[PDB]
């Protein structure tokens, strides 16, 4: 049996959030796609949180 678990991808995929259409960049617009991954290495992220 398996030991480790990356439950995050399971959660994203099961609810239907994660898909090619969701990640596709919008056409002729500046709003971000339906799914966005943030960064925890850029300085000041936790301060903004």
């Amino acid at each position: 049996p398996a030991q480790e678990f990356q439950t995050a991808r399971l959660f994203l995929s099961h609810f239907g959030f994660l898909s090619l259409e969701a990640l596709k960049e919008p056409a002729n617009s500046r709003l971000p796609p339906h799914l966005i991954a943030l960064d925890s290495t850029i300085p000041g992220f936790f301060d903004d949180i």
């Binding site: 398996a2 480790e4 991808r9 399971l10 995929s13 994660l18 090619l20």
Partner: peptide, 24 residues
């Protein structure tokens, strides 16, 4: 030697879903 959805997109979607879910 002398010698109806397209199957490829469905197979690609199934492979991506399977890899995301069951890998590991």
């Amino acid at each position: 030697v002398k010698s109806s959805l397209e199957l490829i997109p469905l197979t690609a979607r199934m492979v991506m879903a399977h890899l995301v879910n069951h890998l590991g």
